Amino acid sequence: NFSKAMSVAKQVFNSLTEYIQGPCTGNQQSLAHSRLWDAVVGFLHVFAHMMMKLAQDSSQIELLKELLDLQKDMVVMLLSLLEGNVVNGMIARQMVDMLVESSSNVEMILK
Numbered sequence: 329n330f331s332k333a334m335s336v337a338k339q340v341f342n343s344l345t346e347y348i349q350g351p352c353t354g355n356q357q358s359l360a361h362s363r364l365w366d367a368v369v370g371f372l373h374v375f376a377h378m379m380m381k382l383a384q385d386s387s388q389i390e391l392l393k394e395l396l397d398l399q400k401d402m403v404v405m406l407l408s409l410l411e412g413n414v415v416n417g418m419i420a421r422q423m424v425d426m427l428v429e430s431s432s433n434v435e436m437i438l439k
Contacts (some may be wrong), residue, residue: 334394337371341401351411359409360419368402369430375399376436399437 344364348354375395382392406423413420426435 330391331394334398338394338401341405345401345405345408346412349404350409353412356409356411356419357427360422365422365426368406368426369403369433370439372430372433376433379437422433 344359348359375398378395379392382388382395409419410423
């Protein structure tokens with residue numbers, strides 16, 4: 329059931345990117361005040377341990393494939409929120425906090 333649930337998550341992430349691409353200040357500002365950061369932290373928590381576990385066995389290589397592009401969809405959304413950002417801007421600062429809170433989780437995809 330993981331494959332079918334993660335496919336839905338890609339569409340939700342893509343839809344959110346559709347709202348903010350072509351920078352829409354109202355939609356970009358609204359997404360920062362919402363609970364999106366909590367969801368991203370939760371996803372990054374799942375992403376770290378699943379990547380290590382799936383790489384152990386070659387039988388789950390196909391499952392790892394949509395695991396990787398789900399990260400790409402989320403990162404594209406994360407990059408879309410930063411379009412037209414200013415130094416010491418609002419949206420950028422919750423991003424710093426969100427990475428800091430999930431520092432242990434994010435410092436596992438890199439390796």
